[PDB]
Design a protein around this nucleic acid. Structure first.
Lengths: 86, 96, 99, 108, 98, 86, 111, 95
DNA sequence: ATCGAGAATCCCGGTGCCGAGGCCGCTCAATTGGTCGTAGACAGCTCTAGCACCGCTTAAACGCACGTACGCGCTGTCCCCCGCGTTTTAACCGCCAAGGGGATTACTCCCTAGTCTCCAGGCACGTGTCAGATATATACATCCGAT
DNA sequence: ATCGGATGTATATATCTGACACGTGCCTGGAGACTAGGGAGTAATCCCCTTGGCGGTTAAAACGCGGGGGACAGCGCGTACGTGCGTTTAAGCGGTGCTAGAGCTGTCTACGACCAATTGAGCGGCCTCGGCACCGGGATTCTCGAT
């Protein structure tokens, strides 16, 4: 069985309190109502660009497995370099 | 003792302008802007070919790396027609 | 005698905690399913190393967090203390995000 | 036994000059055969539609010579050419006529 | 007689003109002396090509003009139609210029 | 001789010139102390660009700054400017 | 042969690999020729930078009561100097979090 | 067999022994410093590349690295880097 | 106006355990030592292009008045979001299974640096127009009172 | 809410003038026809590391329910800056002069690849325990509802 595996929020995953937790790491006191759907949209656009660029690095080596060097390199190219993986 | 020179793309830019709207000219500031434009894109794509070859333990820039690097720089539609014209020129080259 | 502190003590105290801590917030399996779902569009039947999923998690939280930093400066610059979606649209436009 | 002509390239854009510029910029240690054909094709594409949008947007100013104003709005009108060039200033370009809607004087 | 105009017709028509035209519009000798006087601090007894002074003039107009684009969107986002120095400070912090 | 009373190069950026650049930017009305901060911001930007251009010019050991110098210096700061070569 | 088989870093008085950095300058296609004493100079610069960041993470490492540098101390170690932040202003470092910043309107309006 | 991999980690550990000699460091922080040293290394390496390309040269010498450090390093961070750099060039050259 | 529940937060103490640090073999990349064409410091000219100077016109900058409209503080009024108990529910965790695909090592071989010569493509250099700025005179498009 | 000065702005027409599209000459870099070592496609295997499933607990998510404070529209009042006209005033122009230094070309030379033998040095495998968690108990501090 799966015991209610219906992920439901196809992409909502980033629950409402999860976006609350990231905003409160950012130093944000009060959050309006429609913030969450737009936040899912912005995160969706950012991930679409980042792994659109990362999957091309995985395709150029003709490999079927995305690695960590893949996405750190593709993050570097977009001017968002992220240490701690290579 | 005359002097030196220094190449450009201006005759070639003039030729593509003659391909597209042939009875319509071009001014010189815009010619030098197109010149430094194609040097800029040339160094972006050649640079991305360097950073892309510098990952796969390879030391050779074939056309396929230029295909991937164009599919990382140019966004979307003109990436499609750009890469499609690239296959047209590789295949149109070697079939001769 | 039930009595909640107020709208702001949970907020500012919890800002002190979630600024003070270090770990990664949004949960592992829904985020992992998200990256795989967006990944299915450009190519079918991919595979991920786990640390790469942690990497997309880390850059994604840092980009959202910086976006809330800046949209917080936006809405404070309207003499408001509440994030509203047009402020998000402003910082994405001011920064250059707005394509 | 060298009974041959000179015609070879027969395509578009200098394959040899671009090929020199790939070999003499220290990018790889060695550069394959088909690559400057490929990059020359891409640059002729990009050059072609940017001069085309400067062509129609040059005819809209009823001129015959494209000045850098026509390259300014010719780039900044399409989305994709703007996103390729969003960090690039063009000299003698100016701006597109963007006017924020709250500045438009309304009334009866 | 009065004829005058509203405070804003000369402004908005002026926006149509100065958005419409393209030429260089900070005067060339005060700008040139400004670049030389800023240039004397790092090293002394300098010489400039003229077109380089044109080029720094282009960077000045591009960076200032774009800073008024984002500053103007900042103040419009306060329901104000007049920019103020805290808005300049806001767009400079948002672009990361501190 | 010809009046040369021209002290304070920075001030040479006239209040109508800052008005004119605001008019090209699409700015309707300009407050009071905008001009002081405008001369300051322009001063900072030209200080960085000139510093990097001088660094580009001392390295060739040449007394004269060219235009390719400063198009290079504008390229490196992510503010690339065509129309002067390179 | 032999000739006092010595290395380098001690020929310059440093603790960075001149040979490994030197090989990395020759093998990334940066120039067809690479000079005599260039990675000596560059290894000096990187030793200074490494010493600065690890120094400030050491000071913050005592000043938040541990005996071991974690990446959190690299986060608020780097983000507290101005110039190290300006070199690294586009760089996220993982498991870093945010240095504690609170805007003035959020702090309570008490008496 | 297993392919050998390089790093910087023992060198970063050695400078840690120089600055605060009795103080530890964690493993992911060591990989942070490793990727930091690589990142700066390709920054000034690339600046040496195009900065040497502009002057029609084909050689990277220490004057080029001095210029490129005076481009990337902000100010006070440039000066002591140049003082340690000249001290290491001359201190090398005296042997 | 100033004082107590009380709840969250900070201060020691044993535990554990495991990840930080260190030690022992050990392949190989640094090292040392010669060569060698050559990139480049170095000298000197040249001429050209940057800097200096002086007089004239004047667009532009400067400065005074003025008024209204833009900023901004107070007031009320609503509601959306913050806070907290209650359910549930799906994420986390341990372990067990299977193999598809990454990494490795080898095999074979086509291919792209490298050479030398051959020539026309483009590029320096006169040149003279037809495209555009500049008046120059001329009828619309919309602004701004005043009705 | 319409009408008219008026007024800035769009619409032919000449007109000089000069910037660009173009023709002449040249020279060197594109190319063409070979060779050769090596980078890399291509096969096969090793195994490991990604995926998958399944059960057990449960921190977190969802959700319902107060309630108040934060967004926001109105609104009055000040001030500062946009508009426009007289004054100045130095920026642009436009020529004239002088020579400092970019750039060229040649001279001569100290220096980086090429091999090629030699070796310890950093790296992986493999221990080992002390510092950070981590409960676990306990006094401090701060907040929030009272005076």
């Amino acid at each position: 069985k799966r015991h209610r595996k219906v992920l439901r929020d196809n992409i909502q995953g980033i629950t409402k309190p999860a976006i609350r937790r990231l905003a409160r790491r950012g130093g944000v006191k009060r959050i309006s109502g429609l913030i969450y759907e737009e936040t899912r949209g912005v995160l969706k656009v950012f991930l679409e660009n980042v792994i659109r660029d990362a999957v091309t690095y995985t395709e150029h080596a003709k490999r079927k497995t995305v690695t960590a060097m893949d996405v750190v390199y593709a993050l570097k190219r977009q001017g968002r370099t992220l240490y701690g993986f290579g | 003792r005359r002097k030196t020179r220094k190449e450009s793309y201006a005759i070639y830019v003039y030729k593509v302008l003659k391909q597209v709207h042939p009875d319509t000219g071009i001014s010189s500031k815009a010619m030098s802007i197109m010149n430094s434009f194609v040097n800029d894109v040339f160094e972006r794509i050649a640079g991305e070919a360097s950073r892309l070859a510098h990952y796969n333990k390879r030391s050779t820039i074939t056309s396929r790396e230029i295909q991937t690097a164009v599919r990382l720089l140019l966004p979307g539609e003109l990436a499609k027609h750009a890469v499609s014209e690239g296959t047209k020129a590789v295949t149109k080259y070697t079939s001769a | 005698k039930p009595h909640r502190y107020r709208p702001g003590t949970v907020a500012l105290r919890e800002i002190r905690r979630y600024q003070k801590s270090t770990e990664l917030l949004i949960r592992k399996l829904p985020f992992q399913r998200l990256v795989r779902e967006i990944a299915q569009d450009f190519k079918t039947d991919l595979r991920f190393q786990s640390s790469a999923v942690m990497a997309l998690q880390e850059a994604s939280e840092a980009y959202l967090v910086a976006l809330f930093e800046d949209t917080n400066l936006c809405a404070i610059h309207a003499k408001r203390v509440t994030i509203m979606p047009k402020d998000i649209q402003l910082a994405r436009r001011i920064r250059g995000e707005r394509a | 036994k060298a009974k041959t002509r000179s015609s070879r390239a027969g395509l578009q854009f200098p394959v040899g000059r671009v090929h020199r510029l790939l070999r003499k910029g220290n990018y790889a240690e060695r550069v394959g055969a088909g690559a400057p054909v490929y990059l020359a094709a891409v640059l002729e594409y990009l050059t072609a539609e940017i001069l085309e949008l400067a062509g129609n947007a040059a005819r809209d100013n009823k001129k015959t010579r494209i000045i850098p104003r026509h390259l300014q709005l010719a780039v900044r009108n399409d989305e994709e050419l703007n996103k390729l060039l969003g960090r690039v200033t063009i000299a003698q370009g100016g701006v597109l006529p963007n006017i924020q809607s709250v500045l438009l004087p309304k009334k009866t």
